[PDB]
RNA sequence: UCCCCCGUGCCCAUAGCGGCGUGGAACCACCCGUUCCCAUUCCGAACACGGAAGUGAAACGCGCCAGCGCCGAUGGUACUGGGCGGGCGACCGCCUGGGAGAGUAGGUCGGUGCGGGGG
RNA sequence: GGGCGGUCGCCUCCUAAAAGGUAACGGAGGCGCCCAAAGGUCCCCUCAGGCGGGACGGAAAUCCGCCGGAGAGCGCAAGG
RNA sequence: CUGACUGGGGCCUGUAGAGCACUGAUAGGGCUAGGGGGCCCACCAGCCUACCAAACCCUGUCAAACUCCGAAGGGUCCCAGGUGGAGCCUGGGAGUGAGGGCGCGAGCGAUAACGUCCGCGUCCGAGCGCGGGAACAACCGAGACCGCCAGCUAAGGCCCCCAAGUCUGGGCUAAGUGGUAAAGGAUGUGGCGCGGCGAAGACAGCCAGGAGGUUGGCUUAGAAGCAGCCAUCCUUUAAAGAGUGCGUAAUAGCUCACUGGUCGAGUGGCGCCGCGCCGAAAAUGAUCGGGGCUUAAGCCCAGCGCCGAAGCUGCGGGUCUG
């Protein structure tokens, strides 16, 4: 939220990304405009401002762009972003991945598993007005054998549901005994 | 404790021998192929070992287009 | 140790170790990850020595995640044998790893205990392997 | 998905196409790799006779005299979906000669 | 000078798959029989022949549905001719050009010839 | 290094660096044949599997319907 | 004028890379043909499997002998440039068929060899003729016709042997690092960014009632906070747990995490980054070529000059080809 933008006109940018200015591009239906953003601003807001939050982008034309992230290319033996694909949202039920989480006792806390399969809560498409910030999933009693999620009780409030599948969701794993 | 297997066959040396845009005579092999990677078009004949050659002379052309295999077309000159 | 039960061919080559990662940088399973920084090989003895050093370290909770699998047979000739006469015997399968690939991923272990556990298993490997945590650097859209 | 595809060989580059419907027949003559139909003779477009297997003689003479009227002789004959039986449209003018 | 249908093509899954419509005056398909020319390791199912009283259910065409499938852009590296360096080694860095495969947006359930029938 | 052992000819894949070629006592395998049809022409049909069943039936014999576009088969190892 | 090479057009591949749709292996999760089986029931009239597990679908992978994909390049053909000890054809005449080094793509080896064998190129061989690298064939520059008491440069240097700056700037190193190598470790320094605290007085300090249910509970002797268990408290307060380290068999006790001041203006955890320290012990006498070198005579970014070959030009002379 509230990040500055600039322009690119087919530059060098491997030489421009030395002082913390990684390139980018944004679009909703057209106008594939090449931009570059700042790395400590984008990284600092990108600490907690995840995929679910609409990161808005000030532009020198005076517009505030409701963007989000499409991909962050890892530098892969440097752990850095090369290029981040922004996505402007328009009057359209666009796709969203919302990091929902789990609250409650996992499996009767002493006899508890791990509950590690977050997987970014596979897909929810939404209108730009009914877009959420947080949706809650509880883990009320889910001990080791039975009581799995299986995405059957995956009715979120409103808009929308998961479109095609109901198969990828968290489960309970046994611990590591000695 | 000896060498189990160290022999290898002599290469039969297949491959495309006449590319397109080349003037040829009647009888030139367009491609020495193992299997029929190329299908005959106009004025192209196959043999025993799937080898296709030119029936007339002219400027040859490939890829009339797909969905059945790659094509060879010996097109005559007029 | 562990080994692949079936193979198309028994012996295979070595190759080179260039390239950046070819997949395996995002964690996507656990809250932490032991990521490598130098190109080398991972023997099954290095897998076992690092896997025992977790379950003996932390107990009663925390599932350990390994994302390495040895499919490359390390070929070594017997001792006091002259050159030639074919390849050597197969002793232990090794796993090729690239820099910036996450090998070991703890699960259900806290900060001050997972830094320590990944620090103990970091010395079992011949690679400079730094430790990364769960960040927002996933490949989601 | 039934097809026999005797039209796939094409060594002779000039064929006569035959279609037999369950009511009547019609035939064309195509020039290959160009896509131009030269001449054709169609029952119920010229409405020659009612019985469907008695068509073949009059459309054989008619398509034969229109083929010689258009000045094509070296033609061929397809057998795509149908057996060479029943209707024959036999002729003695033009190089098909069957 | 145009729409509908039938043959025959070129594009080679942006042409299909699955679901929902719709059409027989007009072709085409379905149908009713086998009596002869024909046939079946057996049977008119498919070839073949008389038809055509009934039909568009099936199949076949056209129209709709993007998920199923497919195609798939700008950047960004991976990679690499060529040149210049570093590391004891495993292997890396810069410049000059070139430039992927995935993934994302998005697109599509067709486009275009020839010859016939009807209005 | 020689001797001991292995090999000496032909074919298939890789090594083999996107034309062809390319070595090692490099890796994985075959051959010293066979078919009067397992050949030519003409005319019909499309496979292997999975699902729903059966009267025996191993979960595989034989039969029906749907899905299945080539995962079967093409005498013989491997490739096309 | 066709040649090596290059420019404009096509064609071809299945390598690098990438990928799982094909061929196999696979870290998990869901579903569960069925099986040691079944809690055990007039056997099908079940039930969860914390028992195993076929097949299928996802999150994730790997491959010289896998490719739904797929370059950079190379080869080939058409046109153009290309007059060169370029090419093409015939005939005569030898030599060579032990190669090696270097960079890349590889195999074997142990991702060892100044090790073996290929390919792409160079060099030595045949240029042990020259300059630098102290000395050295393949590391760099350069291709020596001869002569001159002439200049300019390439690689490399400018404190002296040794020819040229103790040059001009900005930092860095206190180790002789430079001038011998790794895993690992450490208030070694210098630079960048984040967080808390702070002159409603911050850190280390010096004094303080540093506590009541509460030795919570058979804890096997003993469980008083301190071998190890439960489900983890509350309330008295201007700050305090079922306790930070000792010390006790357990006690007791010492220090506290938490905080009150007379003081005093800065104070800790980090994540990178440049140069450093330890790790670093072999056999005649030690050293980076040597002497020596610390705002450098090292290391990083620059700039202006100069030295610097048998290279090029200045001039003269000879030979060969057209
Ligand atoms: Mg079909
Ligand atoms: Mg046929
Ligand atoms: Mg037919
Ligand atoms: Mg090593
Ligand atoms: Mg090749
Ligand atoms: Mg090659
Ligand atoms: Mg045959
Ligand atoms: Mg020329
Ligand atoms: Mg040439
Ligand atoms: Mg060129
Ligand atoms: Mg490959
Ligand atoms: Mg690869
Ligand atoms: Mg090309
Ligand atoms: Mg010469
Ligand atoms: Mg010899
Ligand atoms: Mg030799
Ligand atoms: Mg050699
Ligand atoms: Mg050598
Ligand atoms: Mg070597
Ligand atoms: Mg030479
Ligand atoms: Mg000498
Ligand atoms: Mg020298
Ligand atoms: Mg020399
Ligand atoms: Mg000379
Ligand atoms: Mg000078
Ligand atoms: Mg001097
Ligand atoms: Mg050192
Ligand atoms: Mg200075
Ligand atoms: Mg000269
Ligand atoms: Mg002169």
From Swiss-Prot, chain A:
Q: Which SUPFAM superfamilies match?
A: Ribosomal protein L25-like
The entry's cellular-component GO terms read: cytosolic large ribosomal subunit
Gene Ontology process terms (BP) = translation
InterPro entries given for it?
Rbsml_bL25/Gln-tRNA_synth_N (IPR020056), Ribosomal_bL25/Gln-tRNA_synth (IPR011035), Ribosomal_bL25_b-dom (IPR020057), Ribosomal_bL25_C (IPR037121), Ribosomal_bL25_long (IPR001021), Ribosomal_L25_dom (IPR029751), Ribosomal_uL5_bac-type (IPR020930)
Give GO MF terms, alphabetically: 5S rRNA binding; structural constituent of ribosome
User: Keywords assigned by UniProt?
Assistant: Ribonucleoprotein, Ribosomal protein, RNA-binding, rRNA-binding
Which family would the database say this protein is a member of?
Belongs to the bacterial ribosomal protein bL25 family. CTC subfamily.
Instruction: Write out the function statement from the record.
Output: This is one of 3 proteins that mediate the attachment of the 5S rRNA onto the large ribosomal subunit.
Q: How does it assemble?
A: Part of the 50S ribosomal subunit. Contacts the 5S rRNA; has been isolated in a complex with 5S rRNA and uL5, 5S rRNA and DNA binding protein II; 5S rRNA and uL18; 5S rRNA, uL5 and DNA binding protein II.
**Name under which the protein is recorded:** Large ribosomal subunit protein bL25
Q: Which organism is it from?
A: Thermus thermophilus (strain ATCC 27634 / DSM 579 / HB8)
From Swiss-Prot, chain B:
The GO terms describing molecular function are: structural constituent of ribosome
**Transmembrane domains' residue ranges:** none
Supply the Pfam families for this chain.
Ribosomal_L27 (PF01016)
Q: Cite the entry's keywords alphabetically.
A: Ribonucleoprotein, Ribosomal protein
| This protein's GO CC annotations | cytosolic large ribosomal subunit
Q: Where is this region: Disordered?
A: 1-14
The keyword Amino-acid biosynthesis belongs to this UniProt entry's keyword annotation? no
The processes (GO biological process) annotated in the record are: translation
Instruction: State its role.
Output: Found on the solvent side of the large subunit.
| Subunit note | Part of the 50S ribosomal subunit.
Matching NCBIfam families, A to Z? L27 (TIGR00062)
Q: Indicate the family of this protein.
A: Belongs to the bacterial ribosomal protein bL27 family.
Report what the protein is called: Large ribosomal subunit protein bL27
What gene name is listed for this protein? rpmA
Swiss-Prot record, chain C:
Pfam families named in the record = Ribosomal_L16 (PF00252)
In the record, biological process GO terms are: translation
Keyword line: Ribonucleoprotein, Ribosomal protein, RNA-binding, rRNA-binding, tRNA-binding
CDD domains linked: Ribosomal_L16_L10e
Any single GO molecular-function term of the entry would be: rRNA binding
Quick one: a GO cellular component term? cytosolic large ribosomal subunit
RNA-binding found in the keyword field: yes
What SUPFAM superfamilies does the record tag this protein with?
A: Ribosomal protein L16p/L10e (SSF54686)
Q: Which family does it belong to?
A: Belongs to the universal ribosomal protein uL16 family.
Task: Give the function comment from the record.
Answer: This protein binds directly to 23S rRNA. Interacts with the A site tRNA.
Query: What binding partners and quaternary form does the record give?
Result: Part of the 50S ribosomal subunit.
- Cited HAMAP family: Ribosomal_uL16 (MF_01342)
PANTHER family, alphabetically?
50S/60S RIBOSOMAL PROTEIN L16 (PTHR12220), LARGE RIBOSOMAL SUBUNIT PROTEIN UL16M (PTHR12220:SF13)
Q: What is this protein called?
A: Large ribosomal subunit protein uL16
Q: What organism does this protein naturally occur in? A: Thermus thermophilus (strain ATCC 27634 / DSM 579 / HB8)
Curated annotation (Swiss-Prot), chain D:
Q: Name one GO molecular function term.
A: 5S rRNA binding
Pfam families, per the entry:
Ribosomal_L18p
This protein's UniProt keywords: Ribonucleoprotein, Ribosomal protein, RNA-binding, rRNA-binding
InterPro entries for this protein: Ribosomal_uL18_bac-type, Ribosomal_uL18_bac/euk
Q: Which GO terms describe its cellular component?
A: cytosolic large ribosomal subunit
The answer to keyword Ribonucleoprotein applying to this record is: yes
> What SUPFAM superfamilies does the record point to?
Translational machinery components
Function in brief: This is one of the proteins that bind and probably mediate the attachment of the 5S RNA into the large ribosomal subunit, where it forms part of the central protuberance.
The UniProt similarity line reads: Belongs to the universal ribosomal protein uL18 family.
Q: What is this protein called in UniProt?
A: Large ribosomal subunit protein uL18
- In the record, what lineage is assigned to the organism producing the protein? Bacteria, Thermotogati, Deinococcota, Deinococci, Thermales
Write the gene name.
rplR
